[model samples]
Target chain A: KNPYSNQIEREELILKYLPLVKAIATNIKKHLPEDVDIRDLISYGVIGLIKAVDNLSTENPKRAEAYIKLRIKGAIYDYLRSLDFGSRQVREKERRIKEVVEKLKEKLGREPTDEEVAKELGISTEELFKTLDKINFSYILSLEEVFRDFARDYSELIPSSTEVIKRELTEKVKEAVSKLPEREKLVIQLIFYEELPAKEVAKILETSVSRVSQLKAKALERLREMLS
Target chain B: NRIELSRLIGLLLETKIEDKVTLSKIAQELSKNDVEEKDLEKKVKELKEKIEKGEYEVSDEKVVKGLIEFFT
Candidate 1:
């Protein structure tokens, strides 16, 4: 079929999975960096939603759901990657600074002052300030860029709705998730949605295995109660 | 803006043929005193021709509607 026809069919299909799209976009926005705009992510997710709808087989709704979710994840990931700073030199400099800081902490039994670290690294304090400023600016600006992309992707997928199960329930769930400690929400999303194994989750989250297990259990219980 | 207006017309066409007539009736009713029925007919015909020729494209209807509502 022509791509235009496919697009039209996909647009028609959007109504069927509208709730799911809204839910996924809302969840992603909740987890995205504070500087990022939720609307941009939602907009980016729309392209995924459109692709999912066009490619879906009517014979398998469950499979369609899985397919669309993966597409959404891919779209968000692409948007996130697009915001990466292109300056390799800047990144290398930042890494060196981190290394110097770690070495100083090891040697002095405390974190080194900026001047001390610069002196040890054979750079003047002014140069250190300039390099650090670049790193800081990149971090802040990149965060905002990623967030804006994510929000745009999200807005594309989910239309405005004053009332809908996914709209209302997802917001409530997000609020509940946010109320828990950061680790708890991370654990819950990793386990329930990402399907990461406990060990891998622990490794990624930088928590002990036992801590990961406990947090996962507590998050699920809290979510269950919140839903109820 | 002309293209966008034409795209909006295409969206109205997609609402089903019966609905299209209903919309025409509504448009006629709204401008019965000021705009001639013949002029309205000509405009609708031109819109239909543009849509059939693929000279215009409809965007997400909700977005388009929201834009219109915002202006009105």
Candidate 2:
């Protein structure tokens, strides 16, 4: 086989599309924090391009370009996720929080309280309050992660099938939302939707801050039970 | 326990849902504010075909060696 000509073709193609790779990566960088280096993005995008080249050659330019752009974007996002320290750090403490909850639940034969969860974790009640605030704030990361988990990986699903699977889940979530108790539904709106702090929400609901947290927690629990 | 609040809100809001799925095809499903699903399916099929064809494309000996070098 003529290795020489084949080698030239790939280099030429990659070099030709190098600008396209850069353009795609630059677009993604706009949404990210200032700390993410464009060089890292380019390097990973090149890896995506390599995978593209390995899998496909320069044939139909438009289709190939779009696919390459997707691969590059996917690879870049995948790299950013690996750097998801915000969510991961919260995830670690959440695991510990749940473990303590489980322990307290078994020991007392009742659900754990904020004070109890804090005491078990060796933190003060105020610190626990802040932690809950942080945990609830960071929980947004779970939406995408959970959807991917339930729907299976995007790569695994057939294109047409993916739509219905996700729609099914969306409808299920909508149904669950509709069935929530009035107060719980209001808390879901106040805290998660409007993004109001628990203090403001407590004021609105004419309840204590901890009570607001309890409502939010119960609301989430109900949804999780139904979804799972 | 792992409910992402914003996305749940998004689902309720009906304006948007930022579910980060891989592959362009399925990823478009999350863009509720954008085009319809069937259009997305057509676009995805186009790209998938490109990937399929590329996967089958054979490189010559030089290209193979070049790729090895590039990878290395």
Candidate 3:
């Protein structure tokens, strides 16, 4: 059996490389816009780090830092892609609505009420509300990116393990979450975290509730694999 | 960040009992003018009624707190 297979040993390895992983995550976040959270990337990196620890071979094929850096990069890439795909469709719809509203205002020479816009667009008030809720979604996504980036930057500046363990744990959790597959992570955030129903989460992801459930299960499984 | 729930409740109560029609009227008037303080006052009154009648619920606290302590 690999010595690194033990929980304590894996944790120790992770602790050793945490700063390096965090630095790479921070560097990636700096390249990204404010729309992405450094914290989220860092969280995603933590997930990758944990995976690296779990998968690390004791045969010493590569430096731990080099291996963990690649994992961190993969984790962050997966995270950003997931967020982009999940919200892109709704965002496109919102952009269309906004464009139409802008055109209508130009033509009619005035702003329109929600009802008027809905009527012009042939949608109900409830539907309008649903569309407007995209703003909330955007805010949540963007702010998460911001916070994650912030955490990564802060994490990079500090040495490994000597600082606040709680802060480290928080960043680790954030990076870990970023590694979660798109639908699973979103559903977890929406359901348990956001207290939204499966139906609501489905609406956001533009999928059937059952599909969301499946994704959610898979995500939790992956998270358990990483965390436990 | 630290809004007093009681103060919010008191302010809400004070507004709910008076000028409940303000929201509809202000929404109607926003086309003619930008959302003025008076219009906002009306919206607040309308929102207060919704709160009193349990038609609407506070969400900022839920959203902020929920997202922050999301992980166990």
Candidate 4:
């Protein structure tokens, strides 16, 4: 509790990590857009540093340093998130999107088309397109969301015994993938199933990233067009 | 219906679900099949907890492990 409570100690403590603020801020900044004022990043880092000092005190140099670095990064990210207008604007709309999708499926007996969904929601196709973009494209990979939903969020998606329901579903799941050729299955496992970036998955599978994209389309096309 | 469902699902995924479209679809499937929302919520909450995974990431294990768990 007494790591840096003294006035002299506190001042020195903050001063010690000033360089780290710049180094970490620089790392996060370069990846951002040109218009984001770098100084905004600086302030975020400084505040993060303050929070770290206030919230954490450690004698273990290694742990303290790690702790400080994490705080700085989080502050920077929180700041960046504040400036992300697109994603921020969409959360409400996404909720609406969910409700409408639900209502439509109930009425129509299946997932609706963009046009059908648009008709139900009373929006044009373009607005529907915009809504879809916000829900899907405006964030990091949507892979886990789908996976979580898929598992129905089943207990942890890790393992089990005759675990029948998921096993029953897993059987269906196996059916979903069983028809795919080995190459497709491999691609599905590494990229689609795993969320490996296409580029990263490519290096592992020794195929161009296109196969990863192409095969998923192939399945969806088959599922949508002829499967019924 | 499978046509729009699968293709739009690609859209939901191309960029994925929490997705109104996908969840409604999943829920639609779930409810119709007599999978109670209470039971499904346990499933949904458990899934929501699994990863902060966004709705769009269509990973492989998600299908066999997660997606079909709900869908089928």
Distance from true location, Cα of A33 in model 1, Å: 4.6
DockQ of each candidate, alpha-carbon based = 0.02, 0.02, 0.03, 0.05
Best first by lDDT, ranked: 2, 3, 1, 4
lDDT per residue (tens digit) for residues B28-56 in model 2: 22232223224433433443354345522
Q: How many residue pairs clash in each candidate?
A: 25, 6, 16, 21
List lDDT for all candidates, in order.
0.50, 0.52, 0.50, 0.49
Model 2 chain B: weakest 10-residue lDDT segment is B63-72
Better of 1 and 3 by lDDT: 3
What fnat does each of the candidate structures reach?
0.00, 0.00, 0.06, 0.10
Output candidate 2 Cα RMSD: 20.0
- TM-score of chain B in each prediction: 0.34, 0.24, 0.29, 0.26
Interface Cα root-mean-square deviation for all models: 21.5, 24.9, 21.4, 20.9
lDDT of 4 by residue, A116-145 (tens): 767777897666654543333233213323
Point out the higher-scoring one by lDDT: 2 or 3.
2
* Order of candidate numbers by TM-score, starting with the best: 2, 1, 4, 3
Off by over 4 Å in 3: A1-92, A98-138, A160-194, A197-228, B1-62, B70-72
Off-target runs (Cα >4 Å) in candidate 2 are A1-125, A134-144, A153-155, A158-166, B1-72
**Residue-level lDDT for A151 in candidate 1:** 41
Prediction 2 global C-alpha lDDT: 0.52
